[PDB]
Structures are given as C-alpha cells and as structure tokens.
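Example 349.
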Amino acid sequence: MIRGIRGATTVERDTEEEILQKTKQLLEKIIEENHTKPEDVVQMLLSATPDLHAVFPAKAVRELSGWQYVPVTCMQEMDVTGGLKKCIRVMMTVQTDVPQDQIRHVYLEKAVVLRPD
Amino acid sequence: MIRGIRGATTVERDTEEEILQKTKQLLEKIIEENHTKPEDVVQMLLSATPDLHAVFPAKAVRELSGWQYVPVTCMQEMDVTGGLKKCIRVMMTVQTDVPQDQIRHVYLEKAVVL
Amino acid sequence: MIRGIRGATTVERDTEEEILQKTKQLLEKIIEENHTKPEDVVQMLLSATPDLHAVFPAKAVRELSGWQYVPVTCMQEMDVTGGLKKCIRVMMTVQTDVPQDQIRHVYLEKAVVLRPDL
Ligand SMILES: O=C(O)[C@@H]1C[C@]2(C(=O)O)C=C[C@@H](O)[C@@H](C2)O1
Ligand SMILES: O=C(O)[C@@H]1C[C@]2(C(=O)O)C=C[C@@H](O)[C@@H](C2)O1
Ligand SMILES: O=C(O)[C@@H]1C[C@]2(C(=O)O)C=C[C@@H](O)[C@@H](C2)O1
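Predicted structure in complex with TSA:
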C-alpha cells in the first residue's frame, strides 16, 4: 500500500542554519522510526508557517545521502490565529505495508503539542 | 490504483464552529459518495483561502469516527483575483479501483460554481 | 509504484494569458518525457509564488485533451527571501514502473536554475 507520514518541528529563529538543522533532524527521525529508504518515497511536501523566509525547508533533504531523486515541494501553511508559530511540517508519502494505525508520525520541538496522540 | 478525490465548500463567516461544520459536512459527503474506508486513505490535504483564519479545516477530520490515523495537512490556497472567497478545498488520496472518470468529486455551498 | 514527477517554470508577467500558457507548456513536456497517460495520474498539485493572482494554473490542465478527470489543486508556495519569482511548480503523482533516478523532472524558463542536477 502507499501511506503518508507526518512530521512537525519548530525553529526559534528564521535562520537558514536552524531551518536546515531542524528540518534534517525531523527527516532523520521519521526515516529512523519508519525504516524509510529513498526508493520507497513517492514524494514529500514541506510547509512553513508564513513567518519563515530564510530558505525552503526542502534544501535539508539534499543533506541526506541517497535522497537526490525524492520529489519535494514546499508550501505556505495557512495563517491560523493561534497556530503554533515558526513551524515546519512534512507529509511524506511512502510505499509501505505497515498498517495505517502503526505508521510513526514525528512531532519535535514546540510541535509536540500539535498532536499528543 | 490510488487516486485523489477533490472537494470544495465555502463558509459564510470565518469562525471555528462554522469552518469545522462545513468542512466535516464536505468530508461526510465525500466518504458517502465514494463509500470510503479510513484505512483506504493514503493522506488528505485541506487548503483554505487567505481570508480564513479561525481554525485549521483539518481539525474537523477528528470528528469522523475511525479517522484519527489518517494523515491530514493544510496549506494555503493562492489568492487569485476573482477567486471564490471564504472557500475550503480538499484533495483526499484513496487506494481504489473505480476508474478516474467515475470518482465522485464534491462541491458544496457556494462552491458548486467551481 | 506511484512516484512523484516535478516541474517548475516562470511567467514574465502576472497575466492569465501567461500563467495558462507557461503551465500548459510545462505540463506537455512532463507528459511527453515521462509518457504520462491521464489515467495514470493520481492527482496533481500546482503551487505559485505569492506574486501571481491573475489565475489558478490548474485551469491550464483543462487545455490538455483527456485531462478532464485528473484531480488538481493549488497552494501558495512559501515566500522565501531570494526565491525564484513568478514561478509555478508542479508535483504530478503518477503510477509508473520507471525507477526513481530515471523519472524526468522538467524545469523550464528561469526555473532552470532551481535544481540543475536534474
Ligand atoms: O522548485 C524547486 O525545485 C526548488 C527546490 C526546492 C528544494 O529545496 O528541493 C523544492 C521545492 C521548492 O519549494 C523550492 C525548494 O524550489
Ligand atoms: O501538523 C499537525 O499535525 C497539526 C494538526 C492539524 C490537525 O488539526 O489535525 C493537521 C495539519 C496541520 O495543518 C495543523 C492542523 O497542525
Ligand atoms: O476547486 C476547484 O475545482 C477550482 C478549479 C481549479 C482550476 O483552475 O481548475 C482547480 C483547483 C482549485 O485549486 C481551484 C482552481 O478551484
């Protein structure tokens, strides 16, 4: 089957180093939890809240050996009033046979309050 | 195959109870029209126009029993001139066999004009 | 498997006649290069940088024969300091047996500079 994996993380500053570090760390954690290999990945979508401008989060994928052919595009998360600020989210679509209810979705930094289930 | 099921609806005011009620009603209808099982849904995207700020349309998914582990995420619709105001659109990806031309895509409220 | 194909192009002006023309061109080249049939497409997402408001690029899909039931939707590409301007991007999800490293992603117009290793 092919399924989606969700991740979320936050930076303390809209700085290219912290966006890339914190996105790469999110990506690593998902891959680790989900045993994901680059050729299992259909595509990835990364969103930033409307207050991060330094760099596109997807540049962090280029710091993962083997991931040069995984499709990615970024997007503006909608501007909700009360939304967790300075947040990056990933929806990674993967060829997998693990059941829906057993996929591991990662939530790091201040994002751990988004989905505490 | 896996295929996507498009939907769109419009709220009449930007407030949580309103956004979530109209998003949940769109989803119940998509699930109804295509007889969708949560375990059949790869992922779902929900976009709102930049004039809606009260709540993520996504939170409405959790009102559909059985849908907790379905991966949903929102994004913003681009502001297009002569665009439908206060509109919420979904792209749901389900594993299915029903031909492309027979997928039942759903447009509700003023979004019937899309 | 189902794999993602990627495209990007740029318009010179924010006019409907241009967003729809550059988006038709970009979709043709991807369909061509990858032999994509409309019934192999799972869905498509198109993003545009926040400086394009003339039209939704998904309307160009309608200009392609047989592409009438392919799901499309758009989103705002995040605004990045030094991002390529007036740019449209396509993430076309398709069912293909072609392998990852042979999928042809097609970058056109000023977008040639975004991923030059493809
Ligand atoms: O269109 C593109 O190809 C480029 C590359 C990019 C990436 O970092 O991988 C991927 C998606 C877009 O958000 C940006 C960043 O532009
Ligand atoms: O990243 C997230 O997981 C959270 C939860 C959310 C939901 O309401 O389900 C789903 C998608 C995101 O757009 C928002 C809303 O943040
Ligand atoms: O919801 C819709 O169906 C309509 C039509 C549209 C298009 O231009 O084809 C397709 C996708 C949406 O993002 C917009 C534009 O609204």
